[PDB]
A paper describes a structure:
Protein O-mannosyltransferases (PMTs) are conserved endoplasmic reticulum membrane-embedded enzymes responsible for the transfer of mannose from dolichol phosphate-mannose (Dol-P-Man) to serine/threonine-rich protein substrates or unfolded proteins. PMTs from three subfamilies form obligate dimers with different substrate specificities and require the concerted action of their transmembrane domains (TMDs) and a luminal MIR domain for catalysis. Here, we present structures, native mass spectrometry, and structure-based mutagenesis of the fungal Pmt4 homodimer. The core fold of the TMDs and MIR domain is conserved with the Pmt1-Pmt2 heterodimer, indicating a shared catalytic mechanism.
Structural analysis by single-particle cryo-electron microscopy (cryo-EM) confirmed ctPmt4 is a homodimer, allowing processing of the data with either no symmetry (C1) or two-fold rotational symmetry (C2) imposed. In contrast, the luminal MIR domains were arranged asymmetrically and only resolved in the C1 reconstruction at a resolution that precluded direct model building. Therefore, we purified the ctPmt4-MIR domain from Escherichia coli via a N-terminal hexa-histidine tag and solved the crystal structure at 1.2 Å resolution by molecular replacement. Our final composite model for the ctPmt4 homodimer was derived from rigid body fitting these high-resolution structures for the TMDs and MIR domain into the C1 reconstruction and directly building models for their connecting linkers into the remaining density. The luminal MIR domains of ctPmt4 adopt a strikingly different arrangement with respect to the TMDs, compared to within the scPmt1-Pmt2 heterodimer; whilst the scPmt1- and scPmt2-MIR domains are positioned to interact in trans with the TMDs of the opposing dimer subunit, the first ctPmt4-MIR domain is rotated by 30o relative to the membrane and consequently interacts in cis with the TMDs from the same dimer subunit. Interestingly, whilst the second ctPmt4-MIR domain is also positioned in cis, it is rotated a further 30o so that it no longer interacts with the TMDs, akin to the scPmt2-MIR domain. Therefore, despite major differences in the cis/trans nature of their interactions, the MIR domains of both the ctPmt4 homodimer and scPmt1-Pmt2 heterodimer have a similar asymmetric arrangement, whereby one MIR domain is attached to the TMDs and the other is detached from them. In the attached ctPmt4 TMD-MIR interface, the active site is completely covered by this δ site, whilst in the detached conformation, the MIR domain is rolled aside and the active site is fully accessible. Instead, the attached MIR domain directly contacts the TMDs via the β8−β9 loop, whereby exposed histidine and charged residues (E465, H466, K468) form a relatively weak interface with aromatic residues of the TMDs (F319, H561, W562).
Numbering used by the authors:
A (entry chain A), B (entry chain B): 49 to 694, 729 to 783
Write the structure that this text describes.
């Protein structure tokens, strides 16, 4: 081909278009909560409802997710709870959440091309680096989910580009462009460290690159004049202000935004000292949830179908259509509307006693439920239900039965979701499962209506599995408790204000301490020595019916080539230094400086983003190598311009063929592992075997 | 005072005499097995009876201990078993065992003085370094026990001295003295790495010091002539042969000695492949080994407490003191004596069948255990045990329960320690854990007796953690198998011979793999960042009747001063380099070179023996810093010669006063903590409080 600015622009546009294509293609396919979408989606939602929470990560990533959610208009109440629940059946915009990391990944590929272009390399080198980042399965798989690692990688690449822009302005110090790019480098580093704490490693890179520069600026005998000590002091002050103080100010600003958005009580208030509880303005749910007492009359509403637990005088038919025999007891149903047949009085287990006031119902208490309209008592037993031969019938019985020979079958455990010992059962806020005490079945319902004999109402029966979310109920109203009762009018709510620095210091210390002790084990934790050559990969999500896995791993051909070129660059530097020690140059001035100033800089970044992971001994995963691998993709491109080099660039055909072959091979490797990256096409068992290269636990073999 | 060779010799003799005094004074006081004397004494004894065993450490240290034991003439059979048993009532020479590390510590102090003397420093600097090593409580406390860290420290100091001797001969290359000191440096490094694997760090130090030298030898433009490439090749070959190949040969020789001494079966044969069991003869000491068959009656003995698994008709009480409710089942206990209630019949899982002969029990088989004296079957279930709310109760049940509705809870897996698939379960030699099949709890016991209701016997319960060594049992006797039975006949007994390299490779791989997985938790594990300033110390041995503790920690004043001088040296080097960048020398040629060639070398050693502990993420203790701290004591001395410097050494009075004051203060600090180092004088409670400087867990307050 050829080389010109128009060709550079065409290649950049094509690379950006293909990046946006690959990152966004099939972004909504997993359509389910995946490996770590749980926590970050929870925190983004908590940002949206302004309820306070606690996390060990710096807030900026979750702020970005919450901004994306707020842009659409979603507020909702779908705080994520478990891996493997459908987003689409919950009216939540997960695609909007996932579009931000995809945008950042596409911009990461564009920024890689920009870094190679600005450094002065030829077109094939920029194309090779941008293509290695483009055709990488790990980068694609990380920018697909609700995960804040894509923001980290994008911020590191932006810091590299900003520092390359700034360093080229070293011949015009303290100008407007000079200060602008200094502050921009500081801001990129600030975003990098405000996403995840490992972003500190970028501060090492730009740190080292500054230090060497300062050393060059401190030489009393240097070709480009000499600086008096006050001038070097001005240079050092500028570097410290733009690279240390501004990043800290932006970090503090992000915590200021975090504190200002969160002004309501929520999960995570207890990690703070009581003064902070005094400033979170405990509100909104507080009003809606009142502790339920024995002898209260309540309504019980199914979370998913919105049906109310209901009864009426009609009885189950003697025979069902399949010939089974019922107890012919009073029907218990789910009813969508409000009427008196929804009213149940919650009563103690054990013998009859006259009513008492103020006895709170608590988590895991055994209770009876008396249907007010018929004066009967809820009961389950091992008689098969109307529609489910495996599930227990629910019915009601007389007082004499409930406190006599059938008493045990009238006892139900109130199991509060996420309940703790002694926790009070509250209207609205205590989602719960109602567990039949003899059998441990959970009271359950579903949408398909009963026949006409059951008034086309929902069936109520006993589910043998307790785990399903369809077993969850809530108490909507304490019907018997008047609107003016003291039990509803004792808020005692006052909210004070603390200085920002005090709150920030308390939160920072608590976050550091919890990150120092609150570690949850994961079966796919990796070690730094396994990353550069992809010895093992992590699995995020899988379902067995469609045979679809989303096993996360890099592109083996691309990673192996990048690491091998890292080794080749090490060898080239060693050989050049050894030949120089003998007094042989063997390198042109232009080709030496670049190999030590630009390419070396890239090799610095990789090192500064890889080696510090050996010092840290907590759990680390393969995605932690995503930043460093990025720098690995840069040196590769440089080394293709280097070894195949004859502005002198006549007959780049050698580098053109080199990059064409390497990128075609990496493209074949990316096509091979593409299903494992996306999980859309169900793959056969023998096809799973072909991907078992270096011992990858695909668990579909 | 003054300075002369006679004064140097007098100071050296006095320092050596005081070293031998301090290391040997009260060496036999603890007169009991202490923190890690167990393992190393076990291995030294096994060396003495020539019975094969397995360890993760290189053999040389235990060879030295066994040589010391053999010199006295002790062979005996007192293989150590538990921490806290008296040596004197067992006819064992523990003082002879402990004299070797004491000799090595005294020689370490002498070698420190020799290193400072040979490098060219003045008398006060050598005295200061040797006194800081002399008056150090950690070095004294490490050279007191049966522990192979003193050998490591002595070998590192010897390698430093040997390399300093060798480097001074650089002006007469390839001479007899040159080669002699090269080989001696290699041999010292070989001993260092053949004691403990962390001795590899010394190879880093002498490695780096060589590399710099080679760089200086590679310069084509250097003041002392120029070397052609063949001459530099000869130099590099000499370094590689004396520093890489000879150390490996000595390491291999120590394994050859280890293999030649061990030609009898012993504990640790099962870690090898059956060829190796074939190359070890079938020996007499603890000869017993007979495969256990279903329907045999056996006794089951706890390895650590020696209690027998036991039962009797008495039942658990309905309520424990804390209000918990038991199953009221038959008690299962640990009993120290021999009686028929220790007898259990081992039976198949699955349905009842009439007895069959010759069905061997194998690794990971599921079994039942029938208590012969009560005709009941061992059972565990998720009911909390007498003393441990977290651990499962062990009880027994009827035949009808064990082969009926409770059958699953009667099944236990026999998991042989280091077992392989299909391995036969044998009396005596198969140490095992008994894993409850439903819950995966391990059958466990501990020393604190049950109350009177349990006859003051040991509790048996289900430990949720399987890894602990306290889960290990063994079968002591096949009670049902008569003494004259064919199964007790001993077969073939033929011993083959393997090439040394094959045995070494198998043993090395197995040792590396077990060190990679076989880690036992310790409550006093420390982190590298706590070492240089003594933030926490380890306790070795203590008895409550005499109020004597042997809490192991360094000398706080000496360690703090040494680390502070390390920091001061860093600052001095930084300031000198910064002034040189401005073009200001500020240092004489002689005072510069020393500060970069001798003192810097010492600072190298410290670094190369401290920083590599951050890369390693296994358990580390304070004694691991003993080598590096040694180098810290050297730079200190150098920095006292440096800053107080006016052969020019007129009026050393400044350095004399400096070293006198520092050593007097360190001597006061060593006197303060001396009881905690020795444990001879019982100290009062208020005296224990005075030693609580930086949060030291003395547990006598
Ligand atoms: C185990 C050890 C191994 C294997 C490797 C160790 C790591 C290595 C080798 C190095 C570490 C990193 C190093 C050395 C530096 C990193 C930080 C530094 C110095 C810079 C940051 C990166 C960074 C933005 C570098 C900027 C480079 C830009 C593209 C230069 C622009 O063109 P420009 O006119 O200046 O070129 C030349 O400008 C000359 C002017 O004088 C002129 O004369 C020439 O004609 C020619 O015009
Ligand atoms: C964060 C970084 C910081 C803070 C610190 C970094 C670490 C530093 C500063 C350095 C790292 C270690 C370094 C540089 C070297 C270690 C290994 C080396 C080079 C040697 C091993 C140690 C080692 C046996 C050194 C031997 C030194 C012996 C005592 C020299 C004997 O006297 P000798 O005649 O040679 O002195 C002079 O000999 C000259 C001959 O030319 C002559 O001219 C002078 O008149 C004068 O007679
Ligand atoms: C004098 C200067 C000289 C010689 C030369 C000029 C050098 C120069 C101009 C620039 C660079 C300077 C250098 C080398 C460092 C400066 C950065 C620094 C130390 C502070 C600035 C960064 C900030 C704005 C905020 C830092 C947040 C704070 C408060 C603490 C974080 C704790 C971290 C980060 C703990 C990392 C482990 C982590 C727990 C793993 C979990 O990991 P994860 O959360 O991902 O799961
Ligand atoms: C080309 C050369 C150049 C450039 C310049 C010349 C350099 C020169 C002349 C000399 C030095 C060379 C250098 C830098 C290294 C050489 C050492 C080396 C790698 C091998 C030689 C050492 C040996 C004789 C035997 C080594 C035992 C073996 C086989 C493996 C051990 C594994 C280790 C040690 C695992 C360390 C962790 C440990 C598990 C923690 C537990 O700890 P612990 O057991 O205490 O509880």
């Amino acid at each position: 081909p050829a080389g010109s600015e128009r060709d550079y622009k065409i290649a950049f546009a094509i690379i950006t278009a293909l990046a946006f294509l690959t990152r966004f293609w099939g972004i909504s396919h997993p359509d389910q909560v995946v490996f770590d979408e749980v926590h970050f989606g929870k925190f983004a939602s908590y940002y949206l409802q302004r309820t306070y929470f606690f996390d060990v990560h710096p807030p900026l990533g979750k702020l970005l997710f919450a901004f994306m959610g707020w842009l659409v208009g979603y507020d909702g109440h779908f705080h994520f709870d478990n891996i493997g629940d459908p987003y689409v059946i919950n009216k939540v915009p997960y695609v909007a959440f996932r579009a931000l990391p995809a945008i950042l990944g596409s911009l990461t590929v564009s920024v890689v091309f920009l870094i190679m272009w600005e450094s002065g390399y030829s077109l094939p080198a920029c194309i090779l680096a941008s293509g290695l980042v483009l055709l990488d399965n790990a980068h694609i798989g990380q920018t697909r989910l609700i995960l804040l690692d894509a923001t980290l990688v994008f911020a590191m690449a932006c810091s590299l580009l900003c520092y390359i822009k700034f360093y080229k302005l070293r011949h015009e110090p303290f100008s407007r462009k000079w200060w602008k790019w200094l502050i921009l480098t500081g801001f990129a580093l600030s975003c990098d460290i405000s996403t995840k704490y490992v972003g500190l490693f970028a501060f090492i890179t730009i740190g080292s690159a500054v230090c060497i520069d300062l050393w060059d600026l401190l030489n009393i005998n240097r070709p480009k004049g000499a600086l008096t000590l006050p001038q070097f002091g001005k240079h050092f002050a500028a570097r410290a202000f733009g690279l240390i103080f501004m990043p800290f100010m932006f970090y503090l600003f992000w915590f200021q935004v975090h504190f200002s958005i969160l002004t309501r009580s929520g999960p995570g208030d207890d990690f703070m000292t009581p003064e902070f509880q005094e400033t979170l303005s405990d509100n909104i749910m507080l009003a809606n949830a009142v502790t339920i007492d024995y002898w209260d009359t309540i309504t019980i509403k199914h979370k998913e179908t919105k049906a109310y637990l209901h009864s009426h005088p009609d009885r189950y038919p003697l025979r069902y259509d399949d010939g089974r025999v019922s107890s012919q007891g009073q029907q218990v149903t789910g009813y969508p509307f409000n009427d008196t047949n929804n009213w149940w009085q919650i009563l103690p287990a054990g013998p009859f006693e006259e009513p008492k006031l103020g006895r709170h119902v608590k988590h895991r208490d055994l209770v009876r439920l008396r249907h007010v309209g018929t004066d009967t008592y809820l009961l389950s037993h091992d008689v098969a239900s109307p529609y489910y031969p495996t599930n227990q019938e629910f019915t009601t019985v007389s007082f004499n039965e409930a406190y006599g020979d059938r008493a045990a079958d009238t006892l139900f455990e109130v199991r509060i979701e996420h309940g703790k010992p002694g926790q009070e059962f509250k209207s609205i806020s205590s989602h719960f499962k109602l567990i039949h005490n003899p059998s441990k079945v959970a009271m359950w319902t579903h949408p398909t209506p009963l026949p006409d004999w059951g008034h086309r109402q929902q069936e109520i029966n006993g589910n043998k599995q307790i785990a399903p979310s369809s077993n969850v109920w809530l108490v909507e109203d304490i019907v018997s408790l008047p609107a003016d009762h003291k039990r509803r009018e004792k808020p005692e709510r006052k909210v004070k204000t603390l200085p920002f620095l005090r709150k920030w210091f308390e939160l920072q210390r608590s976050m550091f301490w919890h990150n120092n002790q609150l570690t949850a084990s994961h079966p796919y934790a990796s070690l730094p020595y396994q990353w550069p050559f992809l010895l093992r990969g992590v699995s995020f999500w899988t379902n067995s019916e469609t045979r679809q896995q989303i096993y996360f791993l890099g592109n083996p051909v691309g990673w192996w080539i990048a690491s091998s070129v890292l080794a080749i660059y090490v060898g080239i530097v060693l050989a050049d230094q050894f030949s120089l020690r003998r007094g042989i140059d063997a390198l042109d001035h232009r080709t030496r400086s670049r190999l030590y100033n630009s390419t070396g800089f890239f090799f610095l970044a990789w090192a500064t983003h890889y080696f510090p992971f050996f010092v840290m001994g907590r759990q680390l995963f393969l995605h932690h190598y995503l930043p460093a691998h990025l720098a690995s993709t840069l040196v590769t491109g440089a080394l293709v311009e280097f070894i195949f080099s004859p502005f002198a660039g006549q007959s780049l055909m050698g580098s053109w063929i080199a990059t064409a072959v390497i990128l075609a091979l990496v493209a074949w490797s990316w096509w091979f592992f593409l299903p494992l990256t996306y999980g859309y096409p169900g793959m056969s068992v023998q096809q799973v075997l072909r991907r078992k290269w270096l011992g990858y636990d695909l668990h579909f073999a």
